[PDB]
Design a protein around this ligand. Structure first.
Ligand SMILES: [Cl-]
Ligand SMILES: [Cl-]
Ligand SMILES: [Cl-]
Ligand SMILES: [Cl-]
Ligand SMILES: [Cl-]
Ligand SMILES: [Mg+2]
Ligand SMILES: [Mg+2]
Lengths: 218, 220
């Protein structure tokens, strides 16, 4: 499972589980900013990785540049977006017949994930856990090209409800996607004491999506 | 509260504080990993340790070391963080002057700082050291370790391998008058990925047994 691949700033370290099935969808999992202790082994990041793995995806989580054994210097976002595109290119190189992808990102990783979504038409679903629309600029989502899940806590002081609600309201004006927006009572930015609750919602969301629900009629 | 700011040697230290409902309640201080491994006071294992002591009636504090979150100052190899932990313990004790006992629980780098605080502070009668790194940080100051406690590590840990943890535990087990409870969790890495429930169950069982007067040697 331990892998090293090349990104624009040098080596990027990752954890990789190929699907046992042919042409399986790919999931890329993206971690928080190091100011909030983000790495590919944060529990929420690991649990996201595990959720996709258990549902038969080819799955990759990885450390952004400067984190762990990943080379380079952390930057405001452009480099990390480039890292994420490199990581997806790498898994796709190994799985050329996977035709679809999901991205799941937590905190800063949700911002990078939604930027990747905008650039990569094969990404047909996303999860954005605790996005920070008062800290990072999400106006590039116009329109958001895919249905997905936004999940945040009502005790979050880093990215408050009012801010997440404004982003979701803007997205919900876009015909042809469904934004599933769950707010968890008592969850802070780190979902302290609420990780099981968070992961059960992400699991339910993915199961319903794999059943063909929670997207509009095309 | 529970959000608190108190003064450390390097400036402001940010914490989360839950006082006990009870009188003379013991104090628990919870210490987080190094920032290279994403350590903050809100790491899930750190939070769960905090919540364990909270639920068992302890006055409980977790906090961010200097440079982490809103805590001021620059991170250093360990001396500063030990000073931070001492300041943190002094602060809680200033608010709870009738508490006569304390536990420290630390994860990774936090376990090394925790055991150093244990060595300095006679009121500390128990500890938990989750994923200690005796191949990276020097534990040889434990001479002897003054209290019984729990060391818990995983057998898939590549940061601090089993052999290294076992060597520290074997050294401590030569010291009479304490009991080192050492659990090795199958399949757990340094981050207990997919094993946090298992880890926290073992921590809970250990504290429950210790509060029942078990897992410490007889008075003799
Ligand atoms: Cl974590
Ligand atoms: Cl921005
Ligand atoms: Cl928060
Ligand atoms: Cl050292
Ligand atoms: Cl490890
Ligand atoms: Mg339909
Ligand atoms: Mg006895």
């Amino acid at each position: 499972p331990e892998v090293i691949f090349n990104g624009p700033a040098g080596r990027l370290e990752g954890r990789y589980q190929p699907s046992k099935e042919k042409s399986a969808p790919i999931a890329i999992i993206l971690h928080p900013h190091p100011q909030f202790g983000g790495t590919m082994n944060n529990q929420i990041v690991y649990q996201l990785f595990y959720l996709f793995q258990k549902r038969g995806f080819t799955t990759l989580r990885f450390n952004f540049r400067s984190i762990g054994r990943s080379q380079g210097e952390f930057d405001h976002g452009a480099g990390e977006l480039s890292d994420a595109a490199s990581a997806l290119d790498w898994v796709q190189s190994l799985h050329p017949d996977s035709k679809s992808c999901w991205v799941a990102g937590y905190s800063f990783g949700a911002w990078i994930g939604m930027q990747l979504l905008m650039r990569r038409p094969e990404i047909e679903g996303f999860m954005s856990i605790a996005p920070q629309p008062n800290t990072y600029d999400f106006s590039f989502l116009a329109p958001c090209p895919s249905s997905g899940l936004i999940i945040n806590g009502d005790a979050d002081k880093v990215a408050p409800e009012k801010d997440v609600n404004g982003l979701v309201e803007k997205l919900k004006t876009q015909k042809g996607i469904l934004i599933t927006h769950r707010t968890l009572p008592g969850a802070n930015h780190f979902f302290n004491g609420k990780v099981d609750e968070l992961m059960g919602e992400c699991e339910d969301y993915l199961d319903r999506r794999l059943n063909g629900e929670l997207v509009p009629e095309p």
